[PDB]
């Protein structure tokens, strides 16, 4: 009866009969509680749904009787993208809930960002805003979903691995016990699965800023520093904080128009006794050679600062910044993949006096809240 609440990037439905509880049985929607009636991969209309397994309502009745608050957590980015009308999705949800026959609270992530599984925004909303202030025991709760990162063929008729691991990673981020729909409703044996190679729980603020520690970030005399690394991974921030703040001239090629004005800019800075930093995407030998030649012509050293971030680390950082930094320029996946395809590690043979390695590390001076968010998986 309480009904729908609309927030900027979240919809919440609370059915008649919902009660706050200290334990929750939460569920994905698409491919977990429902599937297409049509038997197609994608629904042909808002009415193209059926309950996934006939075992489902009995299990839900049993959970409700044991005092579990029933909740749905669903990503519906089609709403934010303008492809799926919110008011049509709302109707579909009410129809599904009527068929399931038990009171549910539903939370819908309409956009990318904090609320989009696997990020735990919807859980935090449930706990902080939508459970009448009752603390929820995560250990006594459960999340059930089909985006579980399962390997192909976990059952007759599925030569296709799970498209996503977002449901399993949501549970991991929150600390919730997790099960697939088949393990949960049908008591099938656990299916084999894979986690992402990069685990953001492993990202430290520890260790040296750069290697070798015996080297110095700055030179007293003119030089050209060439920064190498994936975009959106913190290169420019590091350069701003450590070099530009020390008076290095930020020479940006993308905005100088042509090679000629760039080289001229570089040369004028050097002639003035200044140090120069190139903060661009310089993934391969030919990209970097231009700047090395400029240094050589000017008779100044060229050093490389090689930022260690991997593609998945960089993409993680990008998403984090999208979620937390109003000034962040979102780096597209195409830019990331193009960089990786072109990447050749810097070597001294290119003409560098030395190469410093800049380990991928958590930034200092993120507040505690942001650090907790940083360690969450943010893509399934
Ligand atoms: Cl989802
Ligand atoms: Cl979605
Ligand atoms: Cl688990
Ligand atoms: Cl200077
Ligand atoms: Mg699903």
From Swiss-Prot:
Residues 198-375 are annotated as: Kinase. Residues 3-194 are annotated as: Phosphatase. Keywords: Acetylation, ATP-binding, DNA damage, DNA repair, Hydrolase, Kinase, Multifunctional enzyme, Nucleotide-binding, Nucleus, Phosphoprotein, Transferase. GO terms for biological process: DNA damage response; double-strand break repair via nonhomologous end joining; protein K63-linked ubiquitination. It is found in: Nucleus. It catalyses: a 3'end (2'-deoxyribonucleotide 3'-phosphate)-DNA + H2O = a 3'-end 2'-deoxyribonucleotide-DNA + phosphate; a 5'-end dephospho-2'-deoxyribonucleoside-DNA + ATP = a 5'-end 5'-phospho-2'-deoxyribonucleoside-DNA + ADP + H(+). Signal peptide: none annotated. GO terms for molecular function: ATP binding; ATP-dependent polydeoxyribonucleotide 5'-hydroxyl-kinase activity; polynucleotide 3'-phosphatase activity; ubiquitin-like ligase-substrate adaptor activity. Its EC number is 3.1.3.32, 2.7.1.78. ATP binds at residues 229-236. One of its GO terms (cellular component) is site of double-strand break. Its main location: nucleus. The FHA domain binds threonine-phosphorylated peptides from XRCC1/4, and is responsible for the recruitment of PNKP to the sites of DNA repair. The affinity is ten times greater if peptides are also phosphorylated on the serine preceeding the phosphothreonine. Monomer. Interacts (via FHA domain) with XRCC4; mainly interacts with XRCC4 phosphorylated by CK2 but is also able to interact at much lower level with unphosphorylated PNKP. In the N-terminal section; belongs to the DNA 3' phosphatase family. Plays a key role in the repair of DNA damage, functioning as part of both the non-homologous end-joining (NHEJ) and base excision repair (BER) pathways. Through its two catalytic activities, PNK ensures that DNA termini are compatible with extension and ligation by either removing 3'-phosphates from, or by phosphorylating 5'-hydroxyl groups on, the ribose sugar of the DNA backbone. This is Bifunctional polynucleotide phosphatase/kinase. It comes from Mus musculus.
